[PDB]
């Protein structure tokens, strides 16, 4: 069974950048529902597959991608944030960002733009392209996960579903983006980088 | 020149079903943004058209559908709600709902399902299929408008973007859908329905 | 584990409406590859499932829908054609078609239009809407199958991938559509329809 | 008003790699239809735009992208081929390919894989990313054009619609991909590349 991961910090730990009510709902209600529905969905697919019921498998794909995507994406996101975060990364990851995007600040502008550019629900990502051996920014719709739908290894995700910011920032998504840099866990992003 | 239409009522007219903060933000910020981006996008398209720049015409399509669709969808949505709304339609529209969906309550179950079923942002619609001469439910992603993308004539729209309910109902989209039945402007939906039969 | 069905007729049986070469390639090569890749993908998806590898499950979805759908769609399509086909259906099916589309000619017009209307590869379908209790026309892209992606029960499918007609009709998909009416197996479409009720 | 560009060579100029029948049909009928439908759609769009009819504009988007894209893609494609082509590109373009893909052969493997991997109709592209200042491989579905939908500047396109190869190669798209390398117009790809610096 899939389980809702524990957060690495308390619901209020990312204040004032992301408030406690957003965090609490996001984790204990939103992501919990993805986990719960992915478990059901995986079970039904196992049944369909055992019968070679191809129609049923195909019909189940939206719930698997959405709930499974949601689980993947939110599990990464929590590890990407920290009450002890913010600042800039160091070492090879910082040099990679400079190599690939010109500078840390240009990188932030491009990931901000990809994140602000999502029309509707979705995610902005910093990923690693294994075949090209460099960093790459991508946007993903709804809960479509980065690696599963594009092959890029996720390093840093920014959730731009309205539930992730509306209570606090209302429709002003760029304000949310500006604030989240203050809580990025660059230590985590660097581990993800070094692992691929 | 497209313009932001005034609401037919004050921001707090739909309380307690849809609160005044949702309404004020929804209209004065969200829809407002779509109107201006629509106008600007249209003017960019006229420039691209005049030069036969097909690449630029295609690059502008996401903004035109998103902002155009948003203007269309929200313009209908406000007219679909009323402080004097709720209850059931009468006449031909109710008999069509019965013939097409079995009963009013079954219709509600089916538009609720369509609306709850949207994964991500989008809209639940009751539409009219002009070719088949009957009612039809459909869901649309993001701001993709009903008639522009499916051919169905919009009768009643239910906005299920999180901005439409999160401040009040948080993740619980079904509680928002339960509530909104209390403020549907069946007079407007009936007007839209009869225009299909004129 | 899935396998390639035999055609109900010989490769040349639908001449002159759909030539022999088109049929032979379409069944022995195209559909065969969907079956083979379907088995391969199901086998990968069970390993992924067993390990809770959700990323791998999602990465396999395009192949499962494409090859899965291909096997589903082609399998129905062969049974929907016949050398003894054509004309128009009878009884309850014909009554529904008049009821839902006006008349048989209007129906043909509508399914033709939906088929001609696919931009790129895909299929036009006459289906049954179980919830509404009536016939419904839909188009599906690529190999996306009708029931698995829309819930409609397939009754008659028209393949408008270029491999289904190009050898013979080149780009003129309307000529193909006109011709295929001559080989529609209405006894099969009827059977599929009665089974929905 | 858009027009069908003449080919830079005769219809049998790319024999035996792409046969004359495919070329003639592809240019004189398939591309010509996109030209016509683009003109019509543009004029309908201008009428819609002049009336403030946003529903009408949005309903025309699929025909504009499909036919407009089809015009863009095929116009590039004819210029990307040559009877005097093949081999490896001369100049900076090869050095860029080696930098971005390792070697020419790995580049051919990657564009081949992107092209073979299109499920249904579409295009494989070698593009240039202006933001990153390097080459990038991308696949596009149907006639969605590279620049208009991804921002990448097209350098080399490989049409993998079935009309582009079925008459000759039947379902064996990889055979077509192998053959087309013999007729790439590197002089034209290089012109498009230098235009990106
Ligand atoms: Mn989220
Ligand atoms: Mn809205
Ligand atoms: Mn086929
Ligand atoms: Mn082509």
Swiss-Prot record, chain B:
Q: Name one GO molecular function term.
A: DNA binding
Q: What induces it?
A: Expression is regulated by KRIT1.
Q: How is it modified after translation?
A: Nitrated under oxidative stress. Nitration coupled with oxidation inhibits the catalytic activity.
Residue list for modification N6-succinyllysine: 44, 51, 98, 106
Report which reactions are catalysed by this protein: 2 superoxide + 2 H(+) = H2O2 + O2
Residues reported in the UniProt entry to bind Mn(2+): 26, 74, 159, 163
GO CC: one term?
mitochondrial matrix
N6-acetyllysine occurs at 44, 51, 90, 98, 106, 178
3'-nitrotyrosine: which positions carry it? Answer: 34
Q: What is the effect of changing residue 34 to F?
A: Loss of nitration. Enhanced dityrosine formation on peroxynitrite treatment
Enumerate the UniProt keywords alphabetically.
Acetylation, Manganese, Metal-binding, Mitochondrion, Nitration, Oxidoreductase, Transit peptide, Ubl conjugation
- InterPro entries, per database record: Fe/Mn_Superoxide_Dismutase, Mn/Fe_SOD, Mn/Fe_SOD_BS, Mn/Fe_SOD_C, Mn/Fe_SOD_N, Mn/Fe_SOD_N_sf, SOD_C_sf
Give the superkingdom in one word: Eukaryota
Report the record's Gene Ontology biological process terms: acetylcholine-mediated vasodilation involved in regulation of systemic arterial blood pressure; cellular response to ethanol; cellular response to oxidative stress; detection of oxygen; erythrophore differentiation; glutathione metabolic process; heart development; hemopoiesis
Question: How does the annotation summarize its subunit structure?
Answer: Homotetramer.
Cross-referenced PANTHER family, in alphabetical order? SUPEROXIDE DISMUTASE 2, SUPEROXIDE DISMUTASE [MN], MITOCHONDRIAL
Protein name from the UniProt record: Superoxide dismutase [Mn], mitochondrial
Origin species, per record, is Homo sapiens (Human)
UniProtKB/Swiss-Prot annotation, chains C, D:
What is its induction behaviour? Expression is regulated by KRIT1.
- EC class of the enzyme, as a word: oxidoreductase
Q: What processing steps or modifications follow its translation?
A: Nitrated under oxidative stress. Nitration coupled with oxidation inhibits the catalytic activity.
The biological processes this protein is annotated with in GO are: acetylcholine-mediated vasodilation involved in regulation of systemic arterial blood pressure; cellular response to ethanol; cellular response to oxidative stress; detection of oxygen; erythrophore differentiation; glutathione metabolic process; heart development; hemopoiesis
Q: Which InterPro entries match?
A: Fe/Mn_Superoxide_Dismutase, Mn/Fe_SOD, Mn/Fe_SOD_BS, Mn/Fe_SOD_C, Mn/Fe_SOD_N, Mn/Fe_SOD_N_sf, SOD_C_sf
What is the documented function of this protein?
Destroys superoxide anion radicals which are normally produced within the cells and which are toxic to biological systems.
Q: Which family does it belong to?
A: Belongs to the iron/manganese superoxide dismutase family.
* Protein's UniProt name: Superoxide dismutase [Mn], mitochondrial
Which species is listed as the source? Homo sapiens (Human)
Q: Which gene encodes it?
A: SOD2
């Amino acid at each position: 069974k899939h389980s809702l991961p524990d957060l690495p910090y308390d619901y209020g730990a990312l204040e004032p950048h992301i408030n406690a009510q957003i965090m609490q709902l996001h984790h204990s209600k939103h992501h919990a529902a993805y986990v719960n529905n992915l478990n059901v969905t995986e079970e039904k697919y196992q049944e369909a597959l055992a019968k070679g019921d191809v129609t049923a498998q195909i019909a189940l794909q939206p719930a698997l991608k959405f709930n499974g995507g949601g689980h993947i994406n939110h599990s990464i996101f929590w590890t990407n944030l920290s009450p002890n975060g913010g600042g800039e990364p160091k070492g090879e990851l910082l040099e990679a960002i400079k190599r690939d995007f010109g500078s840390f600040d240009k990188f932030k502008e491009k990931l901000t733009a990809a994140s602000v550019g999502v029309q509707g629900s979705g995610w902005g990502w910093l990923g690693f392209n294994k075949e090209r051996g460099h960093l790459q920014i991508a946007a993903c719709p709804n809960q479509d996960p980065l690696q599963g739908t594009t092959g890029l290894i996720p390093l840093l995700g920014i959730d731009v579903w309205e539930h992730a910011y509306f209570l606090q920032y209302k429709n002003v998504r760029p304000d949310y983006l500006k604030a989240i840099w203050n809580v990025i866990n660059w230590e985590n992003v660097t581990e993800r980088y070094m692992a691929c």
